[PDB]
Amino acid sequence: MENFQKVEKIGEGTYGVVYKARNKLTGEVVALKKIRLDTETEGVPSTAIREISLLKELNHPNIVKLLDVIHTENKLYLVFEFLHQDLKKFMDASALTGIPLPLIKSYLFQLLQGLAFCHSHRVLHRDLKPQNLLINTEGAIKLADFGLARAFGVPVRTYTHEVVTLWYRAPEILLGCKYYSTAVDIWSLGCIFAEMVTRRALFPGDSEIDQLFRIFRTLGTPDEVVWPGVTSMPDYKPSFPKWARQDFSKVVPPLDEDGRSLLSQMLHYDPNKRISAKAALAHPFFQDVTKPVPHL
Amino acid sequence: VPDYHEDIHTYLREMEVKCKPKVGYMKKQPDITNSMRAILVDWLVEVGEEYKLQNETLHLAVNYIDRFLSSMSVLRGKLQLVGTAAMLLASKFEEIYPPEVAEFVYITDDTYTKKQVLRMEHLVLKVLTFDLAAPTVNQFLTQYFLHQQPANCKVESLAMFLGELSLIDADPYLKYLPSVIAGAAFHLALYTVTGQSWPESLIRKTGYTLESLKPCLMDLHQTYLKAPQHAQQSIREKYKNSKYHGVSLLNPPETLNL
Amino acid sequence: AAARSLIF
Numbered sequence: 001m002e003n004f005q006k007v008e009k010i011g012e013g014t015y016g017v018v019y020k021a022r023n024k025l026t027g028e029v030v031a032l033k034k035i036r037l038d039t040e041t042e043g044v045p046s047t048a049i050r051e052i053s054l055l056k057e058l059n060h061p062n063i064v065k066l067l068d069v070i071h072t073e074n075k076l077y078l079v080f081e082f083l084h085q086d087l088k089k090f091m092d093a094s095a096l097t098g099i100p101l102p103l104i105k106s107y108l109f110q111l112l113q114g115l116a117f118c119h120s121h122r123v124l125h126r127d128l129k130p131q132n133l134l135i136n137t138e139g140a141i142k143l144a145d146f147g148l149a150r151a152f153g154v155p156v157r158t159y160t161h162e163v164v165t166l167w168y169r170a171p172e173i174l175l176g177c178k179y180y181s182t183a184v185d186i187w188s189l190g191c192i193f194a195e196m197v198t199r200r201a202l203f204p205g206d207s208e209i210d211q212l213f214r215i216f217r218t219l220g221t222p223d224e225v226v227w228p229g230v231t232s233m234p235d236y237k238p239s240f241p242k243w244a245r246q247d248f249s250k251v252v253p254p255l256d257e258d259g260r261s262l263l264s265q266m267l268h269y270d271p272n273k274r275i276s277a278k279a280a281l282a283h284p285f286f287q288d289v290t291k292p293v294p295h296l
Numbered sequence: 297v298p299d300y301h302e303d304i305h306t307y308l309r310e311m312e313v314k315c316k317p318k319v320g321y322m323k324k325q326p327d328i329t330n331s332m333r334a335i336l337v338d339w340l341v342e343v344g345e346e347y348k349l350q351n352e353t354l355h356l357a358v359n360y361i362d363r364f365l366s367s368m369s370v371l372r373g374k375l376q377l378v379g380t381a382a383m384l385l386a387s388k389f390e391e392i393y394p395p396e397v398a399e400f401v402y403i404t405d406d407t408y409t410k411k412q413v414l415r416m417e418h419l420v421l422k423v424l425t426f427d428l429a430a431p432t433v434n435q436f437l438t439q440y441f442l443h444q445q446p447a448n449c450k451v452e453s454l455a456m457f458l459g460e461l462s463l464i465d466a467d468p469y470l471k472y473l474p475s476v477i478a479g480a481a482f483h484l485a486l487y488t489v490t491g492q493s494w495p496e497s498l499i500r501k502t503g504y505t506l507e508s509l510k511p512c513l514m515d516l517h518q519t520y521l522k523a524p525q526h527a528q529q530s531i532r533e534k535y536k537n538s539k540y541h542g543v544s545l546l547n548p549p550e551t552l553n554l
Numbered sequence: 555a556a557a558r559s560l561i562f
């Protein structure tokens with residue numbers, strides 16, 4: 001720990017304080033996430049435990065690298081490769097003029113790659129959202145913040161009281177089934193896809209129930225045709241307004257026909273039919289993909 | 297899950313290799329003994345149930361313990377501690393919320409202290425170099441269970457129970473990979489309830505022909521038969537609950553037709 | 555159950 005020079009703090013999150021920091025012997029610039037460990041109370045957090053063990057296992061160009069973990073008596077340091085900012089900022093700052101299609105397309109492309117590496121190692125991310133998606137100037141994007149991810153060698157039982165995120169949350173969790181699935185990560189990513197495009201969030205809910213209702217208003221109230229089995233899910237109410245599904249052309253104008261097909265396959269109600277990440281990549285939307293750099 | 301399944305199943309097989317105790321570990325521990333470890337896992341079962349914990353948790357716990365004991369001499373006074381921290385950790389890894397540390401201290405008859413349990417957590421992490429997502433039997437049973445035709449709760453609960461039973465006796469269960477034990481347990485449970493056998497779907501997926509199981513299968517049978525008399529009982533207890541269809545009641549076959 | 559100071 002004596003080998004790093006803290007430079008400047010670059011965001012909070014799970015546990016504590018993340019620094020930009022530089023290795024005084026090698027010049028390498030890193031991101032230190034320093035976890036508090038006055039832990040008179042429960043010891044190493046569960047989030048730390050997961051993000052470390054899983055990241056350890058995952059090595060792929062669109063999943064932020066864990067470089068080292070530093071164990072003291074009294075503090076726990078995670079050392080990550082340094083990347084510049086996070087998709088949330090890029091968007092705020094790119095607002096007005098908007099993020100060029102081709103860059104959107106590569107960001108999506110690049111994420112599906114990482115999601116796919118993740119999913120195909122029974123890791124479930126669970127909290128994809130711009131702030132947890134990290135970009136660099138060479139124009140790569142990467143999965144980050146794995147503090148809630150989970151290994152699914154056995155189905156992953158659902159958080160009865162979810163402290164996660166509303167806006168990116170899958171209908172099927174909203175309606176209270178028992179398990180997660182790879183499908184939830186696709187959802188959050190479809191929602192981030194539509195965000196990059198329209199320059200605003202797709203389903204800005206104000207509580208579990210308002211969420212459902214926003215989803216429904218865009219995509220139309222699910223019934224048993226679309227989603228065999230909905231009407232028998234713990235939180236499903238027969239009183240749910242029966243809104244009709246809107247022409248997607250209406251929801252993401254800027255988007256070519258392919259973009260809409262993908263987007264819809266990713267935002268399918270029923271987790272059995274919502275498109276896998278491995279699939280999405282074959283999608284023709286990705287025919288003409290390049291790798292532009294962002295103007296940061 | 298219908299897409300990676302194979303990728304996953306492949307990777308667990310890869311992982312289970314790297315996450316493996318050493319077999320000889322118990323005889324190189326000065327002060328402790330296969331017995332001693334039995335007493336322990338047994339105890340974990342019981343904690344498992346008291347705090348109502350997912351089964352995987354317990355499978356993890358033992359796996360951590362077995363690797364922790366494969367690098368580190370421990371004295372018998374401190375085993376229950378290693379176990380407590382192994383359990384804490386796995387609960388932290390696999391449960392939605394885990395028991396507080398206080399409870400874990402409580403459940404030992406405050407034989408150790410919060411700061412003791414917390415210190416060991418750390419050492420345990422240190423020693424596993426943080427590698428916690430170990431494949432377990434209970435994972436491969438769950439992968440295996442897809443290939444029933446058709447499904448059958450008794451069978452599942454039975455295979456489970458045999459699974460956990462393997463947890464208790466380092467001899468000879470440490471010489472087997474979980475994917476194998478999980479097969480074994482699967483064929484036995486199948487066999488026992490419905491007289492059917494380890495299916496071609498699974499033989500083709502797993503590369504394990506029946507005959508390749510036989511070694512592991514045999515010990516497991518012997519175990520199934522002897523469990524009512526085994527020094528250690530918390531599991532049989534556990535697997536009486538109607539939650540598990542009374543399967544630990546059912547009558548073991550005396551022969552396997554091998 | 556449970557509460558137990560395992561003697562070895």
Ligand SMILES: Cc1nc(C)c(-c2ccnc(Nc3ccc(C(F)(F)F)cc3)n2)s1
Pocket residue numbers: 010011012013014018031033064080081082083084085086089134144145
């Ligand atoms: C939460 C996060 N957890 C990790 C591991 C984080 C991380 C890891 C590595 N690099 C970075 N860089 C970074 C760079 C810029 C920003 C910001 F805030 F400016 F956009 C935020 C984060 N962030 S943030």
